[PDB]
A = this chain, B = another copy of it.
Amino acid sequence: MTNIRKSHPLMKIVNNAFIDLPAPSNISSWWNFGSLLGICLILQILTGLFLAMHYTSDTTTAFSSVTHICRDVNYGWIIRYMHANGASMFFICLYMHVGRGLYYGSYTFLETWNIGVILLLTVMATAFMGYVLPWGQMSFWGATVITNLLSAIPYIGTNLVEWIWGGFSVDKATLTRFFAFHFILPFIIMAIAMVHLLFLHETGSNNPTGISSDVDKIPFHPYYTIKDILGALLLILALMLLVLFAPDLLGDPDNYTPANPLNTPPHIKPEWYFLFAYAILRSIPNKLGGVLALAFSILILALIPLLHTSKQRSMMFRPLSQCLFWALVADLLTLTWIGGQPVEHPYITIGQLASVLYFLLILVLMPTAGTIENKLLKW
């Protein structure tokens, strides 16, 4: 405080959304993931840009350039692993951002929630092409099965797969296209994320109680900047723990052998954040059904706001729905466990039952849960 501050027609007023923005006081710790997601996004761009200064997309010198990054570049080994393990932190933070909206009814912000699904699709697409960049027998084959799923579409399935592949199979043509696409997509995410906030600042946050918090708003700057800074450190501590103590804990060991189209890995599987999607697709013998269920499960988020039934909004005072919510989270963990395991007789039964429960809970049990409690509250 020094003057009347004069001026004002500049970009500072746009920054009032970071300083003077009203915010609920009772915002819990499940909310730093909003700022953590922004921290993760600019972290991938920062490390990714320096990775792109030594990475070459040609198949003859793609894998060998990744080795040159770690072996030769000064401090180039850490940058590769905060990039590889940051995407693990990105999807760790991404799934709690979705989970909080499910629990606290944040999907009632229809504009923000719908843009959120678009943001989810963009990152999952971006992280898919990044895995193909190292070209390491998991990049080639992980991209082989997933992209070949598009062949189940009729009258365009074969045409667009080759159009996606740039040829008859995954090869140098596909690899160069992915690196260029992997470079641009994150900058699209920044623009959408700004649009994501633009649809939220009109209505503010969503206190865990679920009631309007207009009576108890507090300034953002002195209270939540220091709360997000602490949350950022817990992210850096968690990310750096993987990088400096178990860099390959999450990544598959088979990715360290150069891609060989003539040789198939013992077990072919995507990264851990797509494993739950793999389980749903593998649960149906049909090919067209599997790809649709793979897309429907991801795209079911847009259908959630149309399934609200409870007269309340947050699950704080909905004990019946709380039991179902953690059943869905547990089932989503069962899908992750199933995806990393080979298709044999103990897992086909478990995989089909978990997948049929994943859709049954959200489509039937959860809307019926809200209706039941409405009778129990005389409204």
List the interface of chain A (C-beta within 8 A of B). 9-11, 49, 52-58, 60-61, 65, 111, 166, 173, 176-177, 179-181, 183-184, 187, 195, 198-199, 202-203
A199 to B: closest C-beta gap in Å: 7
Other A-B contacts than A10-B111, A55-B176, 19 sampled, CB-CB below 8 A, are A9-B202, A10-B199, A11-B198, A52-B180, A53-B177, A53-B180, A54-B173, A54-B176, A56-B58, A57-B57, A58-B58, A58-B61, A58-B65, A60-B61, A61-B61, A180-B183, A183-B183, A184-B187, A187-B187
Q: How distant is the Cα of A184 from the Cα of B183 in the complex, in angstroms?
A: 8
Closest to A57 in B: B56
14 residue pairs from A and B, CB less than 8 Å apart: A10-B111, A10-B199, A11-B195, A49-B180, A52-B176, A52-B179, A53-B180, A55-B176, A56-B56, A56-B176, A57-B57, A58-B61, A60-B61, A184-B187
Ranked 9 nearest A-B pairs via Cβ = A52-B180, A9-B202, A53-B177, A56-B58, A187-B187, A53-B180, A183-B183, A53-B176, A58-B61
A64 to B: closest C-beta gap in Å: 10
A9 contacts which chain B residues (CB < 8 A)?
Answer: 111, 202-203
A369 to B: closest C-beta gap in Å: 32
A196 to B: closest C-beta gap in Å: 11
A179, A181, A195 — which one has the most chain B CB atoms within 10 A of its CB? Answer: A179
Q: How distant is the Cα of A56 from the Cα of B180 in the complex, in angstroms?
A: 10
Q: How distant is the Cα of A187 from the Cα of B180 in the complex, in angstroms?
A: 14
Q: How distant is the Cα of A65 from the Cα of B61 in the complex, in angstroms?
A: 14
Q: How distant is the Cα of A58 from the Cα of B175 in the complex, in angstroms?
A: 14
Q: How distant is the Cα of A58 from the Cα of B60 in the complex, in angstroms?
A: 11
Q: How distant is the Cα of A177 from the Cα of B11 in the complex, in angstroms?
A: 32
Q: How distant is the Cα of A358 from the Cα of B150 in the complex, in angstroms?
A: 62
Closest to A56 in B: B58
A57, A61, A176, A187 — which one has the most chain B CB atoms within 10 A of its CB? Answer: A57
A65 contacts which chain B residues (CB < 8 A)?
Answer: 58
A56 contacts which chain B residues (CB < 8 A)?
Answer: 56-58, 176
Q: How distant is the Cα of A198 from the Cα of B7 in the complex, in angstroms?
A: 14
Q: How distant is the Cα of A57 from the Cα of B57 in the complex, in angstroms?
A: 8
Q: How distant is the Cα of A99 from the Cα of B195 in the complex, in angstroms?
A: 35
A126 to B: closest C-beta gap in Å: 15
Closest to A180 in B: B52
Q: How distant is the Cα of A316 from the Cα of B58 in the complex, in angstroms?
A: 57
Closest to A195 in B: B11
